[PDB]
């Protein structure tokens, strides 16, 4: 695949060095050389400077010869124009766009599912890292959840603590009994998840369920949290803001943001929370505030280093849980073993919800998960198929993959199953290297 | 600095080395003529010390490092490829012949010191030209090959493959022709060999004067010309099909280095006619399109000895030679981009002079030089003028009179290597020291001056 | 008509000041309200803030109701995509759309006029200005050269400085296309006909084929010496346009404020001279002779440093200076005095906007002298019994009070206006108001009133 | 005279460029090289980049060797520093400082004439400027109002006008006769010979001398005193700005329009009894909502030369009674001659004024820079007895007085006694004297000299 990249900002970035990942043909556009400058520098890719809404700057990008227009930029209308300018004049395949604006996809449908926007795929990516911080709160003692076929069936992920689990695998499953383990991870390689297995402390583990019986399921797992009630986010940007605005209903919020007129907009802009200009660093703020009675403090500041240290700080004037969200891997190893309870890299989000564009048509939903090196999908499917007449165990799935869940319609059905035709199947890769393989195995 | 991978590539590059002896003693058993003893006795050294440094070592622990490697795999090779000329009793001749000889081989220098090869084993002289053949492939994938080690654009392996076949399809496409024209099948392999790495090397004494015949004259100049040209803008040719016409006269360093050679060329033939130089106003055309090609593009082939040439040609060929091959090529002149960016420069500098509250920018396709490459490339010139007069110096000092020792430098520093000054050119019986300070030249000559100089500032350690 | 304008700021403005002249009802978006205040303040109309992009304010403006979207922002990417919303969300009638990107408009007719982008007409108003001063520059001694129908018929304008002679006695002299469509003495002009005495220091207008104009000109007063040498201040959109057209026939020096702009500039023209630096240092004017120079034409945004770059550039003596004066008060402070030619531009965009709100009848209109006056074109797509001028003769027709024919183009003829000439179908009339106000009129006049 | 001038900015600038315009050594010293690079190029004097306040700077820029510390910077902290290290390292000679800070010279005294801050003269040269202004207000018609001995006599300029001159001097004169008598009158460039029977051409630029106290009824029975000013609004909330403010607040009703927000919240509250507008000088809605009709003065104060000459004539577009422009810019001053703007104030003639006071020795003890900055009109002692001096004693058209020159009055302690060709110098009196060209100053300092 030969993919142009619109953007070398703050997500074309990471797109084009996990897109260079697997063996494609990447070139991507920019507006300045000297983000161009760092990824022709690391990731040998073809490089074009200029503005990526200009037919010249496309065809010295090869819109012509491309399969797909990524187009990520920060403004929504260049996006838009681009994927209309690279339509009318070049053809160019698939045209992912990002769009952030809300009341642009108010009437998605109206403007962006017809030839009038030629988008073929939006990809809000920020919206993402919310509803993950969201899921992530909603779901108390989740290090991860993520939701696959219309929020019906959900992967979510677990550690083990010296007081929770400790016990027979499939011999706590008697007790439950409607859920399967996807995988158990035990130190950076996983490990056979199958009837027998002795559960150690601190493996990270993945449970594949309902997404009705899932905080159910978490409930007599032995560790449903205690319900969230105090909330304070500091960073009033796109996904601080936003995980604001809808956190607010539910739970009480307090958001310290920086910026004078960011804050004063932020304040009329959303009703029912309370905006707080000034530094999420000050002790003075987090104690007046009470940083002490909050539930959780949720970092999303642009600068990495003080999300990082403002969280540490909150958790010494003794914040429940902290929630970092740290774009810069090499820092989310640093605080690994640490008193940070949760990274959140906003890539997770991002890398996975562009993925569903660049896999074929047999796979409407993938999500990266643990390092980004395992991957999980939402697969859809007598004569034609290698899946329709089988049951779960009896397809051969790549190695290392499990089928974790059945969707029919609108049922949920988690080693016996039978497959029937239209029906999705959420599965779990342990490696992503070997999904052209899953590719080709539900492919008519 | 770990110096201690760099020998694992190193010794790794011996033994790639020695498998390369078993091509010219498949001549040495092939054609009956000859010794090739040596080859299969440096097959076998040199295999054993490569081994013997891989061996000890592996690890790919993967700046400074690309340095002293690019500079090893010159010194190293260049050395080791000295080899054949020791043991063998056939062309005896000194140790420092020699190096002289495997340097100047590998290098695509192309001066010799055997006088009277002639009549020589048919696998000495296919080793003499396969050295050139094999450097030939360094200094272009040397232009590719860096980029992980070093920086070109610090101032993939896609195209490695990709490069030798451009290389091969081109030896091979000219050895055809060559024997076409009807040289015998090895003397059209081995020169298509030294006309495709740019070499100059020969089988006969007289190099390209074997056969007047203009069909080989003007074959070596059209071939000369597509290898002095650019391998990675001739990559236009694998990548999709033929659809090479408009990237040539697209880019403007090949734009240049056309202009650059029809004057030369119409300079000299009108100059060699004015003078009645040559008896038919044909073999003026010939031995003018030939010898300016040759001599500017690097190439070194003669087909003259510039009897009747006015001495202005020679001389203004002789400084025509500092530049010479699209950058990137098998040439190695300070290359045309240089002159041209250059050219551009010093009309600008002169520019200023005029409107000096004036913004100029150099340009050359479309987007402007940053100037921190402007200043490369003016430093880049005057260390290449201070390294041709210190080698000229030392020169003067080692024995050689003066133009002599100017004519070596200009012909050593470029890589040519023919006298060319005033009819003085053989190097076989030229001082011993000379001998090496003219290797030293085409070392420098070859590494384009900076990425040996900078090995020997105290900055460089650590 | 109710329009829409989408963008208050520069061209917005103006565009709004002028067709709230006329009674329409005009709502107008933009960016930040601080731009809105001031329009809100004087012209009475509606105001809409917020994204000039989003359905729900196109809604909060009227898209449904309007019958033309006026979509010129200072963004290109926003203007189009607003117009796309608009028609595929509102069905919006009429969608002008401002874009300056030079490569998009290259495939003006692949990208806009084939309903990809649903843009009914672009406009480019710094092209329009470039265009206008590129015309002054051709055309020595010019105060205004607007040419119509295809570049055939051309008003222009010329102070009285030659002249001085009998008004229809030198007509004759010596074949011969021009006539005098109007001439400003004071404030307000006076009836052209056989027998008015010409003044000095009066603006007159004549109106010839765009061929014998240069000719026209030439046996005139003081054709005057052909420019070899140009200098203009300001490197911005229409400073370096301006630049990298006439860059070719002239010889240019241009100075721009901001190193980077002026650096970037340095690169986009291979001929001429970029300076960093200041409109007004004596130093550099007189360091690069601008003693020596024919025309300093100042294109800076800051009104003020215009004006004063071009009378300093006088004093130091440039031949002659064009200064762009975007404040009216100012155009009309600097009259008597040193200012050569003050460009208004509204004077180009007004016009070259106007052609789209009123009917079709009418193919060019063109404001000029303070903008009171009007210049158009109309066609005649009528019949003897459809219409009521085709088939009529010049004198006979019954035409606004203070208009007066110039000229008629029929096909690639150019045929200027005696009383005598035959008015037919598929012709062009070049014609002149001296009072816009009186323009409805000529648009009726001009229509197949239906007779039964 | 070898100066070293401490900042190259904005008023060292013009100080520089006219003490180089008379032949001396000026070396000058800045905070950045940018505004060091134009008056290199320009004026032939040493150039020193560096902290005007540091040592090695002084030394570099001949602390040692000089003869006068120009000290006029940015910083008032940084000027005074200044010359307590050059004093202390150098022993440098004349140790002019220029202070802004008003609480600074609240103890003028106390913290100079000290030795304590050596510093020999202070000179703050914004607060000439607000002077300046305020006596072209409190004198309508005046162009240029100097006083001489302790506001004694007073040399006054006017513009010719339709109404007010227009005569026969002499056959005129007698009309409003009379202590005043015409130091020079400017026609075209240069002026004519003022005697008593010399006509008076149209168009011209008068320069009276008389009394200080006589002066305003000589304003007014001469033709043309100008019906007292009452509402008065100013552009430009900077120092002179809002100095000028505080000042014409107490007599004069005043609008203040201040582009920045912040400077104009502040001074809000800095001035009780003035009008702050927050917005531009341009804007006509501001200028109609305040009645820019019905204003009697608009002073343009605001940094940017252009937008004041601008504004200026726009005010008098839509009717401003009179307009006062501040333009820097000599080129300027020139181009907006014979137009709307009354009256043009080179804050220059107020500064380089009160600065030669300190380079020309103690025989001058005023001196003014005037029409162009090529003329001049100094107070000079004829500091000697009747046997020492070659000006005391002589009569005024028998002393060989410089070529262009013309005394205009002389000060007797508490007495004026304007100068007519007879008179009698006595030693210790004051001699009011007009040069048309200044070359010929050191002509007059000499002349004056035991
Ligand atoms: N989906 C995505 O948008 C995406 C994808 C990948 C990575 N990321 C990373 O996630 C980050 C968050 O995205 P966003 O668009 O919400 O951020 P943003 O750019 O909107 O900025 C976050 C806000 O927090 C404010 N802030 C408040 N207190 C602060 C303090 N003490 N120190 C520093 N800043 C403070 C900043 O001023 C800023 O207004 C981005 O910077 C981006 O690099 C985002
Ligand atoms: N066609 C139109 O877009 C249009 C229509 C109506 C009015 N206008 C007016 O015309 C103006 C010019 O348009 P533009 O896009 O070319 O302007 P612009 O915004 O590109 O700026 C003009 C340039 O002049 C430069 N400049 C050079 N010397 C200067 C000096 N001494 N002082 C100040 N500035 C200096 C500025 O740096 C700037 O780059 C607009 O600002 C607008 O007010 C334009
Ligand atoms: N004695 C002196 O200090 C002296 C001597 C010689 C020359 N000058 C000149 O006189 C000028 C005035 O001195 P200052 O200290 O009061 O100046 P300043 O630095 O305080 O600036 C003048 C003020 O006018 C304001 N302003 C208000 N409306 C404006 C508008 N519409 N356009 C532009 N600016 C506007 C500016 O924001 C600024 O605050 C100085 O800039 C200096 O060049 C002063
Ligand atoms: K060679």
């Not at chain 2, 081109?170 to 009807?182: N, P, Q, S």
């Not at chain 2, 250059?342 to 479309?366: D, F, M, N, S």
């Not at chain 2, 003016?378 to 004519?407: K, N, P, Q, R």
């Amino acid at each position: 695949m030969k993919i142009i990249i619109l953007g070398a900002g703050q997500v074309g970035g990471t797109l084009a060095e996990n897109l260079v990942g697997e063996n494609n043909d990447i070139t991507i556009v920019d507006n300045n050389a000297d983000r161009l400058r760092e990824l022709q520098d690391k990731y040998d890719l073809r490089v074009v400077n200029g503005h990526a809404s200009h037919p010249d700057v496309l065809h010295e990008a090869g819109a012509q010869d491309a399969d797909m227009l990524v187009a990520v930029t920060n403004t929504d209308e260049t996006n838009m124009a681009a994927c209309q300018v690279a339509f009318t004049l070049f053809n160019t395949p698939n045209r992912v766009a990002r769009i952030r604006s809300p009341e642009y996809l108010a009437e998605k449908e109206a403007l962006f599912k017809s030839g009038a926007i030629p988008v073929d795929h939006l990809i809000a990516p920020e919206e993402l890292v919310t509803s993950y911080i969201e899921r992530l709160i909603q779901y108390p003692g989740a290090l991860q959840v993520v939701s696959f076929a219309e929020q019906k069936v959900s992967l979510v992920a677990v550690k083990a603590y010296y007081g929770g689990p400790l016990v027979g695998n499939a011999l706590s499953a008697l007790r439950e009994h409607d859920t399967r383990v996807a995988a158990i991870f035990r130190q950076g390689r996983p490990i056979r998840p199958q009837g027998t297995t002795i559960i150690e402390a601190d493996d990270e583990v993945f449970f594949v369920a309902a997404s009705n019986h899932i905080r159910s399921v978490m409930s007599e797992l032995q560790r449903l949290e205690k319900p969230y009630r105090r909330i304070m986010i500091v960073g009033g940007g796109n996904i601080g803001a936003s995980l604001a605005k809808r956190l607010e209903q539910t739970y009480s919020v307090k958001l310290i943001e920086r910026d004078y007129q960011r804050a004063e907009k932020l304040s009329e802009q959303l009703e029912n929370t309370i905006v707080f200009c000034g530094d999420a660093a000050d002790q003075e703020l987090l104690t007046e505030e009470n940083i002490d009675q909050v539930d959780v403090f949720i970092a999303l500041t642009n600068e990495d280093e003080t999300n990082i240290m403002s969280a540490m700080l909150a958790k010494r004037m003794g914040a429940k849980k902290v929630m970092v969200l740290i774009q810069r891997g090499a820092y989310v190893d640093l605080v690994q073993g640490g008193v940070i309870d949760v990274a959140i890299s906003p890539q997770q989000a991002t890398i996975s919800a562009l993925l569903t564009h660049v896999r074929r048509a047999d796979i409407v939903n993938v999500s990266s998960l643990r390092r980004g090196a395992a991957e999980a999908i939402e697969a859809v499917a007598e004569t034609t198929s290698k899946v329709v007449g089988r049951a779960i165990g009896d397809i051969k799935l790549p190695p290392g993959t499990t089928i974790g869940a059945v969707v029919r319609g609108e049922e949920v059905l988690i080693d016996r199953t039978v497959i029937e035709q239209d029906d999705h199947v959420v599965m779990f890769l342990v490696d992503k290297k070997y999904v052209p393989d899953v590719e080709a195995l539900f492919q008519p | 600095m770990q110096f201690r991978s760099i020998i694992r590539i190193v010794g790794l590059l011996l033994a790639l080395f020695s498998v390369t002896m078993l091509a010219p003693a498949l001549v040495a058993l092939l054609y009956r003529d000859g010794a090739g003893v040596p080859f299969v006795t440096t097959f076998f050294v040199l295999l054993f010390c490569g081994a013997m440094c891989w061996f000890p070592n592996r690890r790919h622990k993967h700046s400074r490092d690309g340095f002293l490697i690019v500079v090893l795999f010159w010194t190293v090779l260049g050395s080791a490829g000295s080899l054949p000329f020791l043991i063998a009793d056939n062309p005896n001749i000194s140790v420092t012949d020699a190096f002289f000889e495997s340097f100047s081989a590998l290098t695509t220098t192309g001066a010799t010191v055997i006088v009277g090869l002639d009549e020589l084993p048919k696998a000495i002289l296919f080793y003499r030209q396969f050295l050139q053949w094999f450097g030939g492939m360094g200094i272009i994938v040397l232009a590719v090959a860096i980029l992980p080690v070093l920086g070109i654009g610090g101032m993939i392996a896609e195209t490695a493959k990709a490069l030798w076949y451009i290389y091969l399809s081109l030896t091979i496409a000219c050895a055809v022709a060559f024997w076409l024209a009807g040289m015998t099948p090895f003397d059209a392999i081995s020169h298509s060999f030294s006309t495709i790495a740019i070499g100059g090397f020969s089988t006969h004494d007289a190099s390209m004067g074997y056969f007047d015949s203009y069909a080989i004259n003007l074959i070596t100049v059209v071939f000369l010309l597509i290898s002095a040209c650019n391998f990675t803008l001739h990559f236009a040719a694998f990548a999709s099909g033929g659809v090479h016409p408009k990237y040539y006269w697209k880019d403007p360093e090949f734009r240049a280095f056309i202009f650059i050679q029809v004057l030369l060329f119409l300079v000299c033939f009108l100059l060699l006619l004015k003078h009645h130089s040559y008896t038919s106003p044909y073999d003026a055309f010939d031995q003018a399109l030939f010898q300016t090609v040759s001599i500017s593009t690097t190439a070194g082939f003669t087909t003259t000895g510039f009897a009747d040439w006015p001495l202005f040609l020679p001389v203004l060929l002789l400084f025509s030679s500092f530049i010479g091959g699209c950058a990137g090529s098998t040439g190695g002149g300070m290359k045309v981009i240089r002159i041209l960016l250059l050219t551009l420069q010093g009309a600008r500098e002169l520019k200023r002079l005029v409107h000096p509250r004036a913004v100029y920018t150099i340009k050359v396709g479309g987007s402007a030089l940053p100037q921190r490459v402007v200043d490369a490339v003016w430093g880049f010139f005057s260390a290449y003028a201070l390294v041709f007069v210190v080698c000229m110096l030392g020169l003067i000092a080692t024995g050689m009179d003066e133009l002599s020792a100017f004519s070596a430098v200009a012909a050593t520093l470029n890589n040519l290597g023919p006298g060319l000054g005033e009819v003085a050119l053989h190097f076989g019986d030229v001082n011993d020291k000379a001998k090496w300070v003219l290797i030293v030249s085409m070392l420098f000559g070859r590494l384009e001056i900076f990425t040996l100089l900078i090995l020997l500032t105290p900055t460089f350690w650590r």
